[PDB]
């Protein structure tokens, strides 16, 4: 079912200008950028039983909830091919469920990008419906149906 | 995640939370048993997978004539009797490196020239 | 050696009579509608014989039967077989 | 043209092969090998084609164009060529190889189906066999094509029957 | 030197020897032989005995039965000009010796006078020596039974399924008892949930069971209640966390059961709990054995399937090449007849009944078999008469006598 | 093809009852992890248990066959890299016949067990028109290898050319590859035998576009001759 699209007038031989739009079309989903999803038992929203995660938390508190954690490591290599920024990503996840699910996230400089979050009477069960609802109904950059695209 | 099953009524182990003491517990939904957590890691959904594998040599992989022989030299034994193949990962994208084998030691040594493998 | 069609009609006729004779004699009220369906069947299987209601209305010897329709049905038949190409 | 292949053989067994837009390393491997052998046939022939004097009947039928193409010259006097099934040269029906007369994981040309002899010298058991698989192909997409072809042909026709240029020059 | 090398030419001589004893028709023959010698007997002995028994069976060479005459010892050439049927008498020692139909014999086989005869000997028979037999002679014409290729049996194969479907992968096994009724019930081990979606559950289908079932329930139904023990039937190496992980979601499925009682229950009280026991004996992976005390051997297989099944969902083994010759069987002469002889021999047995069931107090219409076999080899419409084309159209043709080669 | 044939259907038990008495550990008492190198044994599609060190269980059956104790028809395969023993009896298996090479030649490399003496001892029986085909079979010098058991073996095209050492070449002949291997389990009697009646008649089929031979093998059927002499 392909469909060839040509650039705007001038913007032609602009090599880079290419991907710039590629990623502006080729449907991108969280699921495409994730490397795993993990559910942890962290009850202290002021420290993660996880080492590698420390530095993060510390940052989101200087500047109620649930004890059930859901951690999502992401692929760096997959965040450039189709340009993207932690901010954007989560930022979306957040405005996806809105005011009723706390979210956080490392910085574009950490050797490991991540996304922690908890809910807010059976927490695990509901924290899996939101495991899928987070992979297949969530869009990032692009148009639906249009998988792969090339130059 | 190397999960576990109980004793006596040997089944599956489902996690539950110790509210008062703030800790992780597994259990039996058939019996009554309950054991303490082993780690805080309750689940992992690996999407992207990096697989570069070799095939379990039954050790008689010297008797199977269907394979080719090479005159290279292992890193240790220095013999000259080999019998290579390829990554039994029937995946399309897979690479085309060779996994030889010494008939006088049983050592798996690649011919790669970027990555390094001990497995 | 007569033609299939001539036979159905026969059966249709047979069936018909056995029905009438049941409304001018000992009419067991709802034992009739048990042969009214037979009429309907023949009177129907005569024009068409390739239905979803399985019973192929076979004719002794396993021979299917040639529904009028069966004759016009394209290629090798009346419309496309005798007229568009002779 | 075999070494120019062999080279790209180890140069890919030593993981030194640029994936290439060609997607998949392996996929990108073939596209180089094939392209290398074909390049050889066509050209292996371009040699005979020019060495066949202007008094060679075959050439004459070709020149006049009554019958024959230069290809037919190659495949007869120079070299047949690489056979094929759905594109991908002879596959591995025989668990990691072509014929039981071969060593597992042999990606060399003489096994993925390359007939080196000219129809004049005559194929070898293996050549012959692959060659077959290769030809027998057409004879098939002709057995099925034929099934649907017909139907299309008719429909078109049955659709535009009544269409004729009337007297106003309308249609 | 009676122990040196062997050049090219040398190979030939060996081939000469190949045909000397074999001859270009080997196949066609042997199959018949087999059917006659052994097979023939085995069929007669199975669901034979009634509420009357059947002993050994005799195979007389060709003969002919005509009114105003004795009984001529028949041959080929004659049956061909007279439009006969190079058949032979079937006698079986019944027990309260007996004529039971005619078996169209194959030329040059063991029962054809031609087998033993010699050159000259032949010419006197008018039968061209160069003729190689291997065929039949029905209602005159030379009929041939054609090699029927098919998908081998009692083997496990895994298949990937179309993108647009709830089922991911599947492992199939065609089960057919080598001898006896020959039931053809397939065993389906599915794999719901494609690649990605949560809850990739492994279910399988059993004969006479309208729904599908989680390999677990079955496993516990087989007398294997403790999971992880089940996982011991599925995973042969605990250092294979990938596959292990794969089953987790599955065990979770059967958790609503926990003992061999319920296990057989959810396979439909008291009434249904029985139905299932049988099915899992006579219909479940029916090959291997339908007896009883083998719940273990069965399970281990169901597992061997599932294992294989996943090995593909985990790109370790490609799918199964449906077109690998070693998995294609060629049903020749014998086998084919065999089939016929059974289904037929039963209509006889269930008609021998109709004589006793009326005896308020010589009943064997041997014609049934005799005629049947003709009809088949006659036309080619195997599966039989009545109101059904039921058969495979195209078996048994008229030998080609265009040239010797052909 | 010409040489090809077909299974007729042997019996299992004489191999089943044979096995469990030479290693096979019945499946009733099997314990996974306890035996990882478990090369589970299969026969006519059934799991009759497992067996440890199979190397020998194999060459025991092979020589059991090559004597005539196990019907030369029946096929048994060892899928080492998967630890499985495939044994078949099934009726309907197409199978050809090959020369065995067993290197058991204490006087040199690998070599065809059959020798020039076996042959002259054959052409001797030719001249008398006691050393049949059934002899080269019961004297294990050739075997019946099907499609399945063909997977796990190597084969030489020519008995000669593909054997000696490399210590010039005709500028006219064709160009055959080489003998880069010393594993040859079997050898091909003659290649020609890959053909069928039809083709067998075509002269030099190895000199024509594959399709030409495919047609010619559909006409020699429309030709005339002497379909018999009676
Ligand atoms: Zn427990
Ligand atoms: Zn070594």
mmCIF file of C-alpha atoms in Angstrom, chain A residues 11-131:
data_model
loop_
_atom_site.group_PDB
_atom_site.id
_atom_site.type_symbol
_atom_site.label_atom_id
_atom_site.label_comp_id
_atom_site.label_asym_id
_atom_site.label_seq_id
_atom_site.Cartn_x
_atom_site.Cartn_y
_atom_site.Cartn_z
ATOM 1 C CA UNK A 11 13.847 21.883 0.696
ATOM 2 C CA UNK A 12 15.217 19.285 -1.679
ATOM 3 C CA UNK A 13 18.854 18.201 -1.713
ATOM 4 C CA UNK A 14 18.742 19.031 2.004
ATOM 5 C CA UNK A 15 19.963 15.581 3.081
ATOM 6 C CA UNK A 16 19.292 16.080 6.785
ATOM 7 C CA UNK A 17 16.033 17.898 6.005
ATOM 8 C CA UNK A 18 15.083 14.362 5.052
ATOM 9 C CA UNK A 19 15.073 12.412 8.329
ATOM 10 C CA UNK A 20 13.741 15.640 9.874
ATOM 11 C CA UNK A 21 10.468 14.736 8.212
ATOM 12 C CA UNK A 22 10.920 10.996 8.121
ATOM 13 C CA UNK A 23 10.488 11.018 11.891
ATOM 14 C CA UNK A 24 7.703 13.498 11.338
ATOM 15 C CA UNK A 25 5.641 10.817 9.576
ATOM 16 C CA UNK A 26 6.785 7.247 10.276
ATOM 17 C CA UNK A 27 4.498 6.147 13.080
ATOM 18 C CA UNK A 28 6.561 5.856 16.325
ATOM 19 C CA UNK A 29 5.218 4.116 19.455
ATOM 20 C CA UNK A 30 6.621 3.827 22.923
ATOM 21 C CA UNK A 31 6.835 0.114 22.266
ATOM 22 C CA UNK A 32 9.313 0.849 19.468
ATOM 23 C CA UNK A 33 11.676 2.739 21.773
ATOM 24 C CA UNK A 34 11.446 0.620 24.913
ATOM 25 C CA UNK A 35 13.952 -2.115 25.829
ATOM 26 C CA UNK A 36 11.959 -3.606 28.693
ATOM 27 C CA UNK A 37 9.252 -3.071 31.245
ATOM 28 C CA UNK A 38 9.682 -4.101 34.880
ATOM 29 C CA UNK A 39 7.411 -4.060 37.878
ATOM 30 C CA UNK A 40 9.253 -3.491 41.151
ATOM 31 C CA UNK A 41 8.468 -3.397 44.852
ATOM 32 C CA UNK A 42 9.602 0.083 45.889
ATOM 33 C CA UNK A 43 7.448 1.530 48.774
ATOM 34 C CA UNK A 44 9.705 4.462 49.554
ATOM 35 C CA UNK A 45 8.954 7.115 46.926
ATOM 36 C CA UNK A 46 12.096 8.832 48.265
ATOM 37 C CA UNK A 47 14.604 6.098 47.357
ATOM 38 C CA UNK A 48 14.650 3.211 44.901
ATOM 39 C CA UNK A 49 15.797 -0.211 45.998
ATOM 40 C CA UNK A 50 17.705 0.106 42.741
ATOM 41 C CA UNK A 51 21.248 1.469 42.709
ATOM 42 C CA UNK A 52 21.621 2.763 39.143
ATOM 43 C CA UNK A 53 18.367 4.727 39.730
ATOM 44 C CA UNK A 54 19.396 6.881 42.710
ATOM 45 C CA UNK A 55 20.681 10.068 41.115
ATOM 46 C CA UNK A 56 17.380 10.331 39.256
ATOM 47 C CA UNK A 57 14.950 10.490 42.151
ATOM 48 C CA UNK A 58 17.126 12.944 44.084
ATOM 49 C CA UNK A 59 16.549 15.414 41.240
ATOM 50 C CA UNK A 60 12.760 15.292 41.097
ATOM 51 C CA UNK A 61 12.275 16.152 44.750
ATOM 52 C CA UNK A 62 14.514 19.129 45.307
ATOM 53 C CA UNK A 63 12.643 20.986 42.532
ATOM 54 C CA UNK A 64 -0.929 9.552 48.626
ATOM 55 C CA UNK A 65 0.820 7.473 45.902
ATOM 56 C CA UNK A 66 1.255 3.680 45.445
ATOM 57 C CA UNK A 67 4.197 1.342 46.312
ATOM 58 C CA UNK A 68 4.024 -0.575 43.059
ATOM 59 C CA UNK A 69 6.700 0.456 40.623
ATOM 60 C CA UNK A 70 6.884 0.134 36.833
ATOM 61 C CA UNK A 71 10.282 0.865 35.307
ATOM 62 C CA UNK A 72 10.936 1.289 31.542
ATOM 63 C CA UNK A 73 14.494 1.338 30.190
ATOM 64 C CA UNK A 74 14.645 2.864 26.635
ATOM 65 C CA UNK A 75 16.960 2.534 23.641
ATOM 66 C CA UNK A 76 19.333 5.383 22.973
ATOM 67 C CA UNK A 77 20.120 4.321 19.401
ATOM 68 C CA UNK A 78 16.368 4.360 18.799
ATOM 69 C CA UNK A 79 16.003 7.905 20.078
ATOM 70 C CA UNK A 80 18.048 9.476 17.287
ATOM 71 C CA UNK A 81 17.125 7.433 14.215
ATOM 72 C CA UNK A 82 13.719 9.037 14.842
ATOM 73 C CA UNK A 83 14.711 12.131 16.820
ATOM 74 C CA UNK A 84 13.345 12.296 20.410
ATOM 75 C CA UNK A 85 13.976 13.556 23.966
ATOM 76 C CA UNK A 86 13.172 11.969 27.335
ATOM 77 C CA UNK A 87 11.181 15.052 28.103
ATOM 78 C CA UNK A 88 8.981 14.604 25.082
ATOM 79 C CA UNK A 89 8.527 10.868 25.697
ATOM 80 C CA UNK A 90 7.348 10.845 29.258
ATOM 81 C CA UNK A 91 5.823 14.281 28.746
ATOM 82 C CA UNK A 92 3.499 12.406 26.434
ATOM 83 C CA UNK A 93 2.919 9.466 28.751
ATOM 84 C CA UNK A 94 1.998 12.002 31.392
ATOM 85 C CA UNK A 95 -0.567 13.895 29.275
ATOM 86 C CA UNK A 96 -1.758 10.428 28.275
ATOM 87 C CA UNK A 97 -3.260 9.461 31.643
ATOM 88 C CA UNK A 98 -2.954 12.971 33.139
ATOM 89 C CA UNK A 99 -3.596 13.649 36.860
ATOM 90 C CA UNK A 100 -3.703 10.050 38.176
ATOM 91 C CA UNK A 101 -0.322 8.334 37.711
ATOM 92 C CA UNK A 102 2.985 9.792 38.919
ATOM 93 C CA UNK A 103 5.873 9.756 36.424
ATOM 94 C CA UNK A 104 9.599 10.638 36.424
ATOM 95 C CA UNK A 105 12.639 10.201 34.131
ATOM 96 C CA UNK A 106 16.415 10.362 33.773
ATOM 97 C CA UNK A 107 18.231 12.929 31.634
ATOM 98 C CA UNK A 108 19.466 12.698 28.078
ATOM 99 C CA UNK A 109 22.948 12.406 29.555
ATOM 100 C CA UNK A 110 22.524 9.317 31.761
ATOM 101 C CA UNK A 111 24.186 6.156 30.404
ATOM 102 C CA UNK A 112 20.792 4.562 31.070
ATOM 103 C CA UNK A 113 17.582 6.353 30.104
ATOM 104 C CA UNK A 114 14.569 5.304 32.197
ATOM 105 C CA UNK A 115 10.999 6.029 33.290
ATOM 106 C CA UNK A 116 9.687 5.263 36.775
ATOM 107 C CA UNK A 117 6.059 5.612 37.857
ATOM 108 C CA UNK A 118 3.393 4.407 40.280
ATOM 109 C CA UNK A 119 -0.390 4.288 40.435
ATOM 110 C CA UNK A 120 -2.575 6.477 42.716
ATOM 111 C CA UNK A 121 -7.639 -2.942 46.396
ATOM 112 C CA UNK A 122 -5.501 -4.759 43.807
ATOM 113 C CA UNK A 123 -2.706 -2.530 42.446
ATOM 114 C CA UNK A 124 -0.704 -5.122 40.469
ATOM 115 C CA UNK A 125 -3.604 -6.161 38.257
ATOM 116 C CA UNK A 126 -4.475 -2.571 37.297
ATOM 117 C CA UNK A 127 -0.729 -1.926 36.913
ATOM 118 C CA UNK A 128 -0.503 -4.166 33.881
ATOM 119 C CA UNK A 129 -3.576 -2.972 32.019
ATOM 120 C CA UNK A 130 -1.517 0.200 32.149
ATOM 121 C CA UNK A 131 1.416 -1.931 31.069
#
